[PDB]
Chain A
Amino acid sequence: EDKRAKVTSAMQTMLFTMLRKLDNDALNNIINNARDGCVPLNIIPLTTAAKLMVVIPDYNTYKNTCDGTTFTYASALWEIQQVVDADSKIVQLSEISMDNSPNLAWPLIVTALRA
């Protein structure tokens, strides 16, 4: 079953790497807090992920959401680290303005780190 052997080795590897990439500290300080040790899945990244990715469609949404070098979301502070357009090119925070907006390749993606 050389096929079985290879596929087994594959799934195993994946799981263990995601496990090593688990945020042990924050995951634990919230799972045990739970009354029966059971929590909804949708709140795990919302309360434990250390990186935030925001995809903004136009400039009006940019101004309403990510105005400035820091912003608040999910009851936390996020420090903007790198803004990238739809072409995987680095965009500076001084180029996102109303005058220069039509010359940018929307949408843009903002990567932020938790405070």
Chain B
Amino acid sequence: SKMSDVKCTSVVLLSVLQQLRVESSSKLWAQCVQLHNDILLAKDTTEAFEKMVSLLSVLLSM
């Protein structure tokens, strides 16, 4: 629905980060948790894509 897809990809990406074990960095874990929770709670699809790209930047950094 262009929204549930984003909400599922955010869950998948956070699971990928957890498996990669970014929880060692408390700062990074807190930022990723905040972004994922905000994406899940979002009502509009506009800011959801922005926050999804922000979260994906964390994975792309490594």
Contact = CB atoms under 8 A, between A and B. Distances in A.
Answer yes or no: A and B touching, Cβ < 8 Å: yes
Interface string A80-112: 000000110000000000000000010000000
Contacts, number: 7
Contacts of A87: 24-26
Interface residues of B, number: 4
B27 interface: yes
B50 to A, nearest CB: 23
Contacts of B27: 105
Interface string B11-25: 000000000000011
Please report whether the interface of chain A is mostly helix, strand, loop or mixed according to DSSP: loop
- The contact size tier of chain A is under 10
Nearest to A107: B26
Interface in B12-59: 24-27
B22 to A, nearest CB: 12
A87 B25 CA distance: 7
A86 B26 CA distance: 7
B33 to A, nearest CB: 14
Contacts of B25: 87, 105
A105 B25 CA distance: 9
Please indicate which of the listed interface residues B24, B25, B27 has the most CB atoms of chain A within 10 Å of its own CB: B27
A3 B25 CA distance: 41
7 contacts: A86-B26, A87-B24, A87-B25, A87-B26, A105-B25, A105-B26, A105-B27
Closest 5 CB pairs of A and B: A86-B26, A105-B26, A105-B27, A87-B26, A87-B25
